[PDB]
């Protein structure tokens, strides 16, 4: 289509409300404007992507500082189903993301390469840097791919190096079987290997983390079983934590990722579609985990504070209630409201590591398509 003709600008308005009980509320506006050029015609095309981001409480982006802002752009070059972005850009993959848990995502400065030559295969590579954000600079490079070569099944393999911190490896599989027209099974696994790298700023790291999910769908109902296991004396670690889609036990509050923590969750989801009210969904979860805090090295530079002499039998749990309505028609079409309730308690001195809390979040989201 071409630079002008293929251009699009989106503005995302974000209302964000966060309530915390401890055994502090917060209100914030946010705006994210996104432009994408078309491509100059020819074998090798040229374009531009650019964004700007603002938020205001009603580096530390926002939720704990009265205002925040940022903007950037990247040059894109597209040849043979390969796209190269050079500049500031968003990222989501198993070893790197701006993260979905907070109001504004983090961005990254550098090179990304994405190949779509084969339908069913995505390859990506990259080298970027980023600062520090949410709750000097970092450098990270990754190589990865995602394969779709079978009808109900998907595969991923990724690696990253976070300079002087870690090398991280990740695999996954997801299978879906449709039995009846109303009954389906979704077995799946996530795997993370983590080792220390270079100067080893966080200290020694030898960490293997597993996520198991089994999901029975029946019509609108879906019930899901999760096992998660962290093997090593530091907790599973990743950039921009919370609500991770590469972990089956990542929850509103806790990631159930502590060192040597075994965990499970039972989740229930419902789609109100056939009950007459489409765009309405709800879900509830219960998660339980246990780990032995005596096994942490208290002198571990990055992770030392997980150690507790009195930890031993430490355990915690979380029960999440989640519902969201997207408005599907009229003027507010696409306006989405989402309500989030989490309760978390630990026992066995888990509280020397994390807190007993009750979290309430409300998120109002309005997309605008401007050209
Ligand atoms: C960025 O795209 C520039 C659009 O201008 C069209 C001219 O075609 C040559 C593109 O090469 C620009 C190299 O920076
Ligand atoms: C397409 C969104 C409108 C503005 C995006 C570009 C902002 C320019 O970068 C700001 C750098 O400071
Ligand atoms: C932009 C930088 C250049 O990237 C080169 C990508 O190479 C293209 C992949 O090879 C094509 C394989 O396709 C065979 C059937 O489509
Ligand atoms: C180690 C990567 C840190 C990111 C800083 C540089 C960001 C922009 O990089 C663009 C370099 O483009 C090379 C030009 O190709 C021709
Ligand atoms: C399945 C998508 C292709 C992934 C590109 C390579 C990602 C980098 O991984 C480095 C670590 O991999 C360890 C051994 O890799 C075996 C490579 O061949 C496997 C073929 O799927
Ligand atoms: C659209 C508005 C883009 C704002 O620009 C941003 O603000 C500055 C700080 O005030 C800089 O530090 C950068 O982060 C810059 O991206």
Residue numbers in the entry: 7 to 29, 36 to 70, 81 to 86, 98 to 168, 187 to 422
Copy out sentences from the published article reporting this entry, exactly as the authors wrote them.
In such microorganisms, the majority of small molecules are taken up by members of the OprD outer membrane protein family. Here we show that OprD channels require a carboxyl group in the substrate for efficient transport, and based on this we have renamed the family Occ, for outer membrane carboxylate channels. As expected from pairwise sequence identities that range from 35%–50%, the Occ proteins share a similar architecture, with a slightly off-center constriction formed by the inward-folded extracellular loops L3 and L7 and residues in the barrel wall. The transport data demonstrate that Occ channels have a pronounced preference for substrates with a carboxyl group, due to the universal presence of a basic ladder on one side of the barrel wall.
To determine if the phylogenetic subdivision of Occ proteins exists at the structural level, we determined X-ray crystal structures for seven Occ family members (OccD2, OccD3, and OccK2–K6). Interestingly, the closed state of the OccD2 channel observed in the crystal structure features a strong interaction between the carboxyl group of Asp294 and the side chain of the central basic ladder residue Arg389. For example, the dominant states of OccD1 and OccD2 have very small conductance values (∼15 pS), in accordance with the small/closed pores observed in the crystal structures. Interestingly, both channels show occasional upward spikes in conductance, suggesting the occurrence of infrequent gating events that form a larger pore. Indeed, we crystallized such a closed state for OccD2. Thus, remarkably, OccD2 and OccD3, while efficient in arginine uptake, are not uptake channels for carbapenems. OccD channels are highly specific and transport basic amino acids.
